[PDB]
Write a protein that binds this ligand. Structure first.
Ligand SMILES: [Mg+2]
Lengths: 87, 73, 295, 82, 70, 75, 77, 92
RNA sequence: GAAUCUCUUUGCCUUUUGGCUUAGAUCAAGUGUAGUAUCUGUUCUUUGUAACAUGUUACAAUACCAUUUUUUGGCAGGACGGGAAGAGGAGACGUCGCGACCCUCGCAGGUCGCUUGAUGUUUCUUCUUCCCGUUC
RNA sequence: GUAUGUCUAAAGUUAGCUCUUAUUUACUAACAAACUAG
């Protein structure tokens, strides 16, 4: 049905979220919103290869790989979230 | 006064062309189906890159979010 | 939407709370004129102030569209214009008769109409301006038109007279052989209908046309409104009609079929009924108890 | 309703600053704020992203081109502490 | 996020600018209001103090929590 | 949707700036809930220094997703 | 004193040749004749001619349904 | 019966190739807005063309100071926002 | 077998014609304004769970891609750093600072230098020597 | 226009349908171009 409710099955799942600015988030979802807004924990984000804007955002955080205790991401910014292979 | 959903469902089974919003890519093919929200489904799609052909692709879908226009050839 | 539950308390006077109205288009305040005590304002919950300077009960408490000052119609032959912000003395109309409902023209804060019970109506400014003497009986309730510019009067006679902006002569005087009277009346908010209580327990509805004749089947019959000064009400943009009765009951109404919808058993004759101009489903009512039950 | 929109509706009669999504900043007196974050702004002093500074009488920016408004700091005491 | 009320939020907007401020309230559209917000562009360097500002949820990319309250 | 109050700007020479850094002056004839703005006396202000009088009385209309802002030239 | 959906249709009755601008693409414009539209300003246009803004040429494209989300500014000639 | 008018316009509308690729379990190639061509199988389809894929073989392009090289990775499980979706193309 | 309820018919009249004379007598010959009443013409519509003292708080279920928000207008010995000197980075627009000959004078930052202060747009086109830190 | 009829605090009695809108028709007027009532 609504695949927003598919992401609500993914609580405490160790995923890798990729964002629209190229930000690669790696961590575990605590919960997700009905507008796909994803809160996460124990997550360090990389800005893969390039090192060539966004990058500024990564340095904005105590973060290139920076890890933050709690991260809330707007659901409109997600390109694709990779789920654990055992699922 | 051909309104768009009367325009385009009547334009089914015609070799139509669609320019994307990026203008790097166009698609020429027969429009098979179109919903109310203007998603497009083309068969025998030939990709036109910057106005020159890229190659034959086949049964194709185009998201609503990228259709700049659609033309009849 | 329909009121269905008796929600909030609002314990006002232990006396009657004989007048309830709203600020138009800003549902923040109410008014409550009890029998012995003076006017109280409830918010939404809270309370603001008393308005000392009355001795007798109050018929009606009408605002302006400037909304800063309301108009008090007490039984003590005295009309007082009170600010809702400070509560000072603009005028003190010591009158000859016990005044009826005291209203204001929507254009000017100057233009200001006081009904009496010695069959007269007096127009005022910020100070007599023009009399009005065509009713034979004590005048009961008043209205206006969209944005004013004319005026509506009805009495203990069955007559309703549309008077104009400072003109004695009625355009239409509305009378048949079977009408009891028109003791209270409110403008339907599309500003084209004309609803009025009548003591055949029925709420008649006329037009606002030059050919001013009534329309059939829009008559609201199932009441006990015979011996009490009961108010009318209208929802936002005219979806229903609420009206109290003497069964300690509040009765709502449709428009196209005009049939009974909710016969509530609110704990004394329910008289004063107002809607919200903001909340599209809730209705404030008070009878002779003083506890202001909101539906 | 929306609490930020309710916050912005109380900001009428106050001097704000509006930075736009292309980058330009609009400092002016907020008189009329719409429910869709549209704002009528009087006596606006405007600054380009490159630094070109002008003053204008009336500006009216749509919702979806606003980065952020800055309301004056008197608002944060009441009625939005609850 | 209602859990996250009244914390300092290091919130990352669309253009790489980072806002740090105390979360006064949020809504359905993630419109944020920030007490004593500061704005920094290039990443301590290049920061501007704004104060009580709004922040529309159209521009936020992510928000993280900075510190505890008082 | 609330009506965007531009009644103060009716029959007024306003200055719409547009996505792609376009700037178009004109006199307002109408608007809607999507802020789609109708302009009498269309004046395209191009880049260097012409001023393209575009539609002098033929009442152009601009879609609300492309309107950045507007300055009333008069009060 | 004309709301804009009543100001699209007067291009349609009088059948005027119409110049339409795209959205965040300033190099190209489209000119043609308005033949149909909807409530979301998705416009079907007749005799559609591209206008390279940077002498202004044209490639005749004829019938085009231009999707309204790229429509910016509606004029005529 | 709200859902049947939703799902039968879904059936022979433009969502057919996302409905046919999954049923026949045939890989469709997906080109996104940042040129991440994704050839993958479909597990599920959504209203927004949200897609859950399996054995994803994302291929993209990295440009440097000489001949462009091809970078590709295999992703076993993938969830994809429909916003990046431009083209769903089924290969026979 | 004793009796209740509902019908049909009959009987009672049940809101059931309460004076008289010359049928008591005689019947528009306009208009305008207005009022009342009616017809016709015309247009629109069809819940569980937890905590605290019946109430309050928290979390889930039920109710929801078209321009202003969340379903994208997107993409394309050796190294390093700083300061100084010599030989073949510079000009605009603003935005905040170190000095002051200035202004101003009290309890509820404006102006001028910078004598090499910081910083974002926007156009054009490095080597040698010494000193101080980090690394092997 | 009469007859005639009706109203009038100064004084305080003890706890098909819903609708806008115009034409027509009917009955009325001591309302108009110095006076006429049972
Ligand atoms: Mg007689």
């Amino acid at each position: 049905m609504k695949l927003v409710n598919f992401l609500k099955k993914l609580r405490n799942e160790q995923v890798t979220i990729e964002l629209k600015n190229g930000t690669t988030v790696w961590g575990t979802l605590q919960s997700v919103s009905p507008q796909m807004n994803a809160i996460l924990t124990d997550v360090k984000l990389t800005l893969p290869q390039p090192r060539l804007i966004a990058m500024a955002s990564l340095y904005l955080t105590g973060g290139n790989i920076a890890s933050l205790q709690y991260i809330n991401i707007r659901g409109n910014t997600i390109r694709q979230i990779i789920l654990p292979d055992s699922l | 006064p051909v309104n768009p959903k009367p325009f385009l469902k009547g334009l089914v089974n015609h070799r139509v062309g669609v320019k994307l919003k990026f203008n790097s890519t166009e698609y020429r093919g027969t429009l098979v189906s179109t919903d109310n929200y203007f998603n497009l489904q083309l068969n025998e799609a030939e990709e036109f890159v910057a106005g020159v052909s890229h190659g034959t692709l086949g049964e194709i879908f185009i998201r609503c979010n990228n259709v700049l226009y659609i033309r009849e050839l | 939407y329909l009121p269905k539950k008796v929600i909030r308390n609002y314990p006002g006077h232990p006396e009657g709370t004989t007048a309830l109205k709203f600020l138009p288009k800003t549902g923040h305040l109410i008014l409550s004129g009890g029998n012995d005590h003076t006017i109280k304002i409830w918010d939404f919950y809270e309370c603001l102030r008393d308005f000392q300077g009355h001795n007798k009960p109050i018929k009606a408490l009408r605002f302006t569209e400037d909304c800063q000052s309301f108009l008090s119609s007490s039984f003590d032959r005295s009309v007082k214009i009170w600010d809702t912000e400070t509560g000072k003395v603009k005028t003190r109309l010591h009158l000859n008769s016990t005044p009826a409902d005291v209203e204001s023209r929507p254009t000017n804060p100057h233009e200001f109409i006081v009904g009496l019970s010695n069959s007269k109506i007096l127009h005022y400014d910020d100070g007599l301006v023009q009399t009005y003497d065509h009713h034979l009986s004590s005048i009961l309730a008043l209205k206006y038109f969209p944005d004013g510019s004319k005026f509506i009067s009805s009495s203990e006679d069955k007559t309703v007279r549309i008077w104009e902006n400072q003109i004695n002569v009625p355009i239409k005087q509305i009378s048949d052989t079977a009408q009891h009277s028109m003791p209270f009346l409110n403008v339907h908010p599309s500003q084209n209908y004309f609803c009025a209580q009548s003591m055949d327990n029925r709420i008649y509805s006329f037009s606002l046309k030059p050919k001013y004749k009534r329309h059939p089947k829009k008559i609201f019959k199932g009441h006990s409104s015979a011996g009490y000064g009961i108010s009318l009400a209208f929802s936002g943009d005219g979806r229903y009609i609420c009206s109290g009765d003497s069964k300690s009951r509040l009765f709502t109404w449709d428009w196209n079929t005009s049939r009974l919808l909710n016969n509530i058993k609110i704990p004394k004759p329910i008289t004063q009924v107002d809607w919200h101009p903001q909340e599209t489903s809730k209705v404030i009512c008070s009878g002779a108890a003083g506890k202001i039950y909101v539906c | 309703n929306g609490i930020p929109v309710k916050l912005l509706n109380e900001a009428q009669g106050h001097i704000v600053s509006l930075e736009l999504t292309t980058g330009a900043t609009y400092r002016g007196k907020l008189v009329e704020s719409e429910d869709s974050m549209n704002v009528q702004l009087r006596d606006v002093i405007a600054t380009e992203p490159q630094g070109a500074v002008t003053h204008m009488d009336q500006i009216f920016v749509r919702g979806s081109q606003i980065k952020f408004i800055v309301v004056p700091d008197l608002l944060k005491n009441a009625p939005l502490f609850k | 996020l209602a859990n996250l009320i009244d914390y300092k939020l290091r919130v990352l907007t669309q253009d790489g600018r980072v806002y740090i401020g105390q979360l006064m309230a949020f809504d359905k559209h993630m419109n944020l209001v920030l007490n004593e917000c500061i704005e920094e562009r290039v990443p301590k360097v290049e920061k501007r103090v704004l104060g009580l500002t709004i922040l529309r949820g159209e521009q936020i990319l992510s928000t993280v929590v900075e510190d505890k309250p008082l | 949707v609330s009506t965007p109050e531009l009644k103060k700007y009716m029959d007024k020479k306003i200055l719409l700036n547009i996505n792609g850094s376009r700037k178009v002056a004109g006199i307002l004839r109408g608007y809607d809930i999507f802020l789609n703005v109708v302009l009498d006396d269309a004046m395209e202000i191009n880049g260097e220094d012409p001023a393209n009088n575009h539609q002098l009385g033929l009442q152009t209309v601009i879609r609300g997703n492309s309107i950045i802002s507007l300055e009333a030239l008069d009060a | 004193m004309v709301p804009p959906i009543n100001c699209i249709f007067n291009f349609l009755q009088q059948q005027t040749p119409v110049t339409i601008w795209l959205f965040e693409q300033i190099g190209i414009r489209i000119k043609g004749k308005i033949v149909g539209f909807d409530e979301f300003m998705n416009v079907v246009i007749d005799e559609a001619v591209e206008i390279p803004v940077n002498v202004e040429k044209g490639t005749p494209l004829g019938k085009i349904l231009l999707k309204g989300d790229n429509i910016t500014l509606i004029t005529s000639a | 019966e709200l859902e049947e008018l939703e799902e039968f316009e879904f059936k022979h509308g433009p969502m057919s190739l996302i409905n046919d690729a999954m049923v026949t379990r045939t890989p469709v190639i997906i080109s996104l807005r940042n040129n991440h061509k994704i050839i993958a199988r479909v597990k599920a389809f959504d209203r927004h063309c949200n897609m859950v894929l399996e054995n994803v073989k994302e291929l993209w392009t990295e440009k440097k100071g000489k001949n462009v090289i091809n970078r590709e990775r295999f992703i076993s499980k993938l969830f994809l926002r429909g916003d990046s979706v431009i083209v769903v193309l089924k290969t026979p």
